Design a binder for these strands. Structure first.
Ligand code: ATP
Ligand code: ATP
Ligand code: MG
Ligand code: ZN
Ligand code: ZN
Lengths: 302, 662, 445
DNA sequence: AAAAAAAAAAAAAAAAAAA
DNA sequence: TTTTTTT
């Protein structure tokens, strides 16, 4: 199996286009990325009309030969780290599924489904979505998995659409210690009220930042806005090494000090924050209180 | 085997055709052609054909284009061979093209097995009248107008037969697209009998034949045109459209006919043209800027230079100053025209709301203001240009019309003028004198972008994306400043409101302005005087020196820039001032008809948005910035201000100074 | 040669009789219910076919016309097996069962069809413009000779691989010294099926730049006939094949056409005069109708992007619902529709409502008052190219009978064209007296 | 081997006419 | 001068 977004349920072209690893490796958010992708497809020899068909109806001979095609072509672009070994579950004549696809469907179903009062309503719809995902586990239901798969497609599309805008506008400010970016205004901001969706976006962003010529591993701070509450949701993200790296430089995983920094600043100053997430690296802050708080975080020992 | 190029100079057989097919000759020709297209260095020191192959691989199309003069400058004997014997040359050249292409893309054969090489521009040009006996079985270059297009049908490429009287399977056979394969002795048995086609193992092509007349601007006056038939093989299908002027490079061939010999009493033969390359020549008659099948297409380095020069400061200033470098003044028009020919982004909300994304422009003023020259330059500039004038266009002419087919004997639709303008511009001269029945028919074309016909039992709806640029003259031949716009023209609100940018140009008496204009005009006349390495490149550099003194950038680069900007870049609009634009629109709703005469509606707000999007397009940016919004609002407010009476012009000008503060 | 056919038929029968989800054999139950209500047809979903086995799908993909008849006779074999008792050894009025497919492959537009799709299964969508009348086709022919005078039966399958595909008449007689083909067709004691022809036009918003829409021809037969009406968006699944043109220009031409295998429609032929909705959908409609304020829900839902106008939206909803048709003992009719005219200033978005209203109503046509004529709306009299006989072809207002018509720029139309609609909207019946053709044709809109 | 065409209906452009 | 109607 390969690091591909819903390979067995979307066309191979869209799979390569939305796969985060290929995105990071070849910069598909501008034109040269698409040109290199088309060159790769041509050198493989799959037609652009063929590669844009569903995996079921796509040609059987090249379905069989896909492994050899990848082995012989991917070396030039250096994407050979996309091939791995995984698990596949088959139930009679129903079809085939894989662990990565199933967990992505579950994650998307958790994300999307169906002042204090609004916060309580959000926290209760989160539990409702959790129970819906739980019920989706059993093998007697598949209409709660097809919906999850299509919603995963939609969510990944929206995340890509927002990330291309971020990297185009160059909102990533490089401070002395830690990078910072704030989504002041844009599209589809209402989706990012979910911490897991925000983490997915941040994971893609940190992958993109890592897959560059920069040799600095800096923590990242990301913020959002919901005009209904007039609050900023802030999450701290750790740097990540390139996936294709040896294990010798893996003595200790990169730690996360953001929870300690947040608790120390909240203890020493009377900010209007609300630290109640089980993930201690995610806090809520006020719009007027954000900027001085950030200053403090800059001036504090990390 | 002496595989030397010089040995091809002297022929050993009686004719060229029987000498080319010689086994010794063919392989030498193939290897020389290979060494040509693998190594031909352009002026930049890089093989242009390498870039051509890369682009073809990216686009996985079915046509590789070879410049003729490139082949002429090096290995000219092969150019002569191709000019005299096309059939025996093109096959070998296709084979070497496949070899070269799979040198870059191995296993590309799964995409396509063969290629159809096209020649760019032959040196000699013939018209339909100057066709003789000698120019047969050789390349010709014919200009014409398409009249009747047949359609798309499949063909047989590799024909095989099964002879059942002996059970003999015949080998694959070709076809020449105007004959029938006739087999006499039926393979080794040497016996005549029945056989079947058994086309379960066969491969298909598709062709399309069309009627080619003479260009009405080329025929001698008061004479009649000469028709010919053109057959279009695979990959050239539907490239040509009815009603357009085209130029075709092809092969002239002859064939026998029965009824032709019947009606004349003499052994006369029919002739058809097998198309080999097609180049559109509608509107854009300036055919000296560059060569090639398509002048609006770009190479990769041209895209790189587009990106490089799209980022410098004040690029909009250079672009606006680089349009019509032979007309003095009229900065506002020089800006409105650019904003009109870039256009906006069409908007589709949920598939149930449609917002037009193109800008109309109207000009108005006294005679002698060079409006027609601007219109001519616009026609020369855009990718799709349609020119009309005054009484010379009827309402049913601009729009599609219902016609009865004189052969198939029923009704059918005929493409109107606006249909050719789809994805392009339609230019109207003398807008005011056109009869109102000929004027009211384009409301949907301006606004809804749709054409609907319910005539003679046919109920269909077409599609038209056209930007209308019009010019006219006010009542009495001169614009009276002390009257509102309602008493200066005969148009009404419904037609006026559809126009986004409306410019009024006045003729006024001045001293130093007249002196400067006269100096510029005289220097322009003395500049364009016909009497002031390879000769052609020295001519080209002289032309470049002549052009660089008034235009900041060369025009062919500008045309390719226009095409690139219209094709790829799509701006997006996020960070715009809600209250600023809302207050501006409220202010324009105030005053206006409530104090004056000019009508203002919600469509002008969409016009402001579209102008801002166009300004964003000018810089090859995906996101609108605030400066572009400022420029758009400045243009709109200025256009509204300078269309009022002189009694209130200064007062309104000082009133509106806060939104365009800058 | 026969062994391959037997193996293929056996494999298809095994698939039919062995496929099951959870605790249900879906296709066997489908066959039983179909036979009970005299709908001799079966529907195969391609995903199930692929999942059960891939080699059978490969064989169906390679040669459709050669393979389909084997499946459509295996179906009738299974039906005879599971519907009729052998009674240790009758009517047997079971013809060959019709096979209908459904799939979810990538759509291919009309203009992208080329020589590489010959004899392949493709999926496409368009708009229906013209429908031919029904016609008969023979499937079982009784053949009698003249000299030897013996009887024979010929079985005809309706699938064509080559252009001919037809054994006209056997050469010589069956065994003295007869002629070449001394056979005649016994019209009595034969079996006939029904066939219809349709025309497809390209979808408006996929037309390439500066082009005119292209037409294509389709053939449907048996139950697929009389399912669509002109002017309804459809999705077709079938085979793209060719037929020779001897009666026709060019060399080796072969006009292409489409053989319909499956049709999906947006209206599901529901209005084409009884109700056939399932209980779930009817219950849902009743539940929505039970809402105490659904009037405001519908009023808001009319053109959500248009702001401010309220009475016009209420009037549009009232028009969409329509009145109540009436009749009387003495024959007097009473109109059952309402006609709304918008007469307003520019810039108020009048037509933006017209195209949305065209989108909502199940039967709607949009046309401009400038590009219209009296003869081009009510009824047009043509004459055939070949037989010259005059016939009546309807225009626009009759094409949208039983729905609503969207006219914009009502003033720009000529005075002569604005008088023909008087009776057409006051009495809903248009009368034509041209070339000896007298006809009272109805139009309710 | 050949029925093939006079009679209608509908769609324009030009010119002249009336207001 | 303009729009209408007829050829
Ligand atoms: N700066 C200029 N401003 C105006 N005219 C200029 C200028 N420079 C040159 N000209 C000349 O003035 C003439 C104006 O064009 P032309 O006489 O064809 O009519 P127009 O002004 O376009 O419009 P109209 O036909 O309505 O009178 C052209 O011959 C053009 O070459
Ligand atoms: N109330 C409104 N809300 C939103 N948009 C509006 C409204 N009124 C007009 N518009 C805008 O007007 C624009 C053009 O409208 P449109 O041309 O359809 O108007 P109309 O009244 O039908 O005009 P016409 O009488 O000239 O045919 C649209 O882009 C639409 O967004
Ligand atoms: Mg309108
Ligand atoms: Zn033989
Ligand atoms: Zn007999």
């Amino acid at each position: 199996d390969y690091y591909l977004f819903l390979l067995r349920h979307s066309s191979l072209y869209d799979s390569f286009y939305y796969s985060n690893y290929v995105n990071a490796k070849l910069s598909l958010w501008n034109e040269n990325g698409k040109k290199r992708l088309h060159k790769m497809f041509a050198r493989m020899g799959i037609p652009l009309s063929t590669a844009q068909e569903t995996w079921l109806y796509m040609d059987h001979s090249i379905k069989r030969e896909l492994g050899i095609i990848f082995d012989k072509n991917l070396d030039r672009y250096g994407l050979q780290d996309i091939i791995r070994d995984g698990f596949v579950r088959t139930l009679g004549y129903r079809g085939s599924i894989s662990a990565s696809e199933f967990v992505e469907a579950l994650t998307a179903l958790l994300e999307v489904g169906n002042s204090a009062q609004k916060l309580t309503n959000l926290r209760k719809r989160w539990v409702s979505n959790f129970w819906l995902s739980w019920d989706a586990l059993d093998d007697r239901k598949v209409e709660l998995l097809n919906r999850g798969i299509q919603l995963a497609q939609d969510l990944q599309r929206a995340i890509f659409n927002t990330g291309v805008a971020i990297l185009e506008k160059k909102l990533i400010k490089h401070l002395r210690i830690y990078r910072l970016c704030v989504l002041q205004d844009g599209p589809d901001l209402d989706l990012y009220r979910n911490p897991l969706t925000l983490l997915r976006l941040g994971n893609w962003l940190i992958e993109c930042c890592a897959e560059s010529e920069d040799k600095q591993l800096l923590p990242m701070v990301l913020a959002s806005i919901d005009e209904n509450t007039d609050t900023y949701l802030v999450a701290g993200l750790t740097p990540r090494y390139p996936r294709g790296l040896d294990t010798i430089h893996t003595k200790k995983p990169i730690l996360n000090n953001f929870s300690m920094a947040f608790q120390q600043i909240t203890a020493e100053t009377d900010a209007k924050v609300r630290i109640d997430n089980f993930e201690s690296s995610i806090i809520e802050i006020r719009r007027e209180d954000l900027s001085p708080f950030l200053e403090k975080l800059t001036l504090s020992g990390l | 085997e002496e595989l030397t190029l010089e040995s091809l100079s002297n022929v050993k057989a009686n004719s060229y055709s029987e000498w080319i097919t010689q086994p010794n000759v063919s392989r030498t020709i193939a290897r020389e052609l290979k060494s040509f297209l693998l190594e031909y260095t352009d002026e930049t020191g890089r093989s242009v054909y390498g870039a051509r192959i890369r682009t073809l691989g990216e686009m996985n199309s079915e046509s590789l284009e070879v410049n003729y003069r490139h082949l002429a400058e090096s290995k000219a004997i092969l150019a002569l061979f191709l000019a005299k014997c096309p059939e025996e040359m093109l096959k070998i050249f296709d084979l070497v093209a496949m070899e070269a292409t799979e040198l870059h893309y191995p296993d590309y054969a799964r995409i396509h097995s063969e290629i159809h090489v096209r020649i760019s521009d032959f040196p000699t040009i013939y018209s339909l009248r100057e066709l003789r006996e000698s120019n047969l079985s050789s390349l010709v270059r014919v200009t014409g107008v398409v009249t009747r297009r047949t359609g798309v049908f499949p063909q047989l490429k590799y024909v095989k037969f099964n002879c059942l009287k002996c059970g003999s399977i015949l080998g694959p056979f070709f076809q020449d697209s105007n004959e029938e394969i006739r087999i006499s002795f039926c393979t080794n048995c040497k016996s005549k009998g029945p056989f079947r086609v058994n086309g379960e193992k066969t491969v298909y092509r598709n062709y399309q034949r069309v009627t080619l007349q003479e260009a009405p601007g080329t025929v001698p006056p008061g004479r009649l045109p000469r028709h010919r038939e053109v057959i279009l093989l695979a990959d050239l299908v539907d490239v040509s459209k009815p009603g357009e002027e085209v130029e075709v490079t092809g092969i002239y061939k002859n064939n026998y006919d029965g009824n032709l010999n019947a009606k004349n009493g003499f052994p006369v033969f029919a002739t058809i043209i097998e198309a080999n390359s097609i180049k559109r020549r509608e509107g854009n008659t300036a055919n000296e800027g560059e060569e090639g099948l398509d002048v609006f297409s770009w190479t990769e380095e041209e895209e790189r230079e587009f990106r490089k020069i799209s980022r410098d400061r004040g690029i909009i200033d250079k672009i606006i100053s680089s349009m019509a470098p032979s007309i003095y003044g009229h900065r506002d028009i020089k800006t409105a025209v650019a904003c009109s020919l870039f256009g906006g982004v069409p908007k589709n909300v949920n598939g149930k709301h449609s917002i037009r994304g193109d800008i109309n422009v109207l000009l108005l003023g006294d005679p002698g203001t060079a409006k027609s020259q601007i219109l001519k330059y616009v026609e020369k500039t855009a990718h799709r240009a349609v020119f009309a004038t005054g009484q010379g266009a009827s309402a049913v002419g601009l729009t599609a019309s219902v016609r009865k087919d004189p052969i198939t004997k029923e009704w059918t639709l005929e493409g109107g003028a606006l249909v050719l303008a789809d994805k392009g511009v339609c230019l109207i001269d003398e807008f005011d004198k056109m009869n109102d029945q000929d004027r009211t028919s384009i409301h949907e074309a301006m606004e809804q972008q749709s054409i609907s016909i319910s005539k003679a039992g046919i109920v269909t709806t077409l599609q038209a994306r056209c930007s209308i640029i019009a010019a006219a003259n006010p009542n009495g031949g001169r614009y009276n400043s002390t009257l509102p716009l309602a008493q200066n023209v005969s148009l009404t609100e419904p037609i006026l409101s559809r126009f986004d940018i409306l410019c009024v140009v006045r003729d006024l008496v001045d001293e130093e302005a007249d002196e400067r204009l006269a100096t510029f005009v005289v220097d322009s006349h003395v500049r364009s005087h016909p009497e002031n390495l390879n000769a052609r490149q020295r001519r080209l550099q002289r032309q470049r020196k002549k052009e660089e003194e008034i235009s900041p950038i060369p025009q062919e680069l500008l045309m390719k820039y226009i095409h690139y900007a219209r094709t790829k870049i799509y701006p997006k609009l996020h960070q715009m001032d809600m209250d600023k634009v809302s207050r501006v629109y409220a202010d324009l709703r105030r005053e206006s008809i409530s104090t004056g005469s000019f009508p203002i509606t919600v469509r002008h707000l969409e016009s402001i948005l579209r102008i801002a999007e166009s300004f964003a397009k000018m810089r090859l940016s995906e996101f609108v910035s605030s400066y572009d919004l400022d420029r758009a609002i400045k243009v709109v407010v200025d256009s509204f201000v300078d269309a009022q009476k002189v009694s209130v012009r200064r007062q309104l000008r000082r009133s509106f100074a806060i939104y365009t503060l800058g | 040669n026969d062994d391959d056919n037997t193996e293929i038929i056996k494999s298809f029968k095994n698939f039919i009789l062995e496929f099951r989800l959870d605790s249900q054999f879906i296709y066997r139950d489908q066959l039983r219910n179909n036979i009970l209500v005299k709908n001799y047809s079966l529907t195969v979903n391609m995903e199930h076919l692929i999942g059960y086995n891939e080699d059978i799908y490969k064989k169906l993909s390679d040669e459709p016309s050669d393979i389909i008849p084997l499946f459509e006779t295996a179906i009738t074999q299974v039906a005879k097996r599971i519907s009729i008792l052998s009674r240790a050894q009758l009517l047997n009025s079971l013809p060959t069962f019709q096979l209908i497919l459904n799939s979810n492959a990538n759509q291919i537009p009309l203009r992208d069809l080329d020589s590489e799709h010959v004899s392949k299964i493709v999926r496409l969508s368009g708009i229906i413009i013209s429908t031919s009348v029904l016609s008969s086709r023979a499937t079982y022919l009784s053949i009698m000779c003249r000299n030897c005078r013996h009887t024979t039966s010929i079985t005809i399958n309706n699938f064509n691989s080559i252009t001919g595909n037809t054994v006209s008449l056997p050469r010589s007689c069956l065994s003295k010294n007869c002629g070449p083909d001394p056979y005649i067709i016994i019209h009595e004691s034969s079996k006939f099926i029904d066939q219809q022809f349709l025309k497809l036009q390209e979808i408006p918003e996929l037309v390439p730049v500066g082009e005119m829409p292209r037409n294509l021809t389709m053939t449907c037969d048996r139950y697929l006939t009389n399912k669509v009406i002109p002017g309804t968006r459809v999705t077709i699944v079938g085979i793209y094949s060719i037929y020779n043109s001897k009666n026709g220009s060019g060399v080796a031409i072969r006009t292409p056409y489409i053989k319909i295998l499956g049709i999906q429609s947006d209206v599901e032929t529901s209005s084409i005069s009884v109700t056939m909705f399932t209980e779930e959908e009817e219950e849902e409609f009743l539940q929505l109708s039970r809402n105490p304020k659904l009037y405001e829900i519908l009023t808001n839902s009319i053109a959500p992007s248009i702001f401010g106008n309220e009475d016009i939206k209420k009037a549009i909803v009232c028009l969409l619902m329509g009145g109540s048709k009436k009749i009387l003992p003495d024959g007097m009719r009473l109109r059952g529709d309402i006609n709304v005219l918008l007469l307003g200033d520019p810039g108020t978005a009048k037509s933006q409502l017209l195209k949305f209203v065209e989108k909502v109503s199940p039967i709607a046509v949009y046309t401009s008052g400038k590009g219209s004529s009296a003869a081009g709306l009510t009824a047009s009299v043509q004459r055939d190219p070949m037989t010259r006989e005059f016939y009546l072809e309807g225009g626009a207002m009759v094409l949208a009978d039983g729905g609503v018509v969207c006219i914009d720029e009502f003033d720009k139309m000529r005075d002569e064209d604005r008088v023909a609609i008087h009776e057409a909207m006051e009495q809903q019946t248009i009368s034509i007296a041209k070339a000896g053709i007298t006809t009272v044709l109805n139009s309710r809109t």
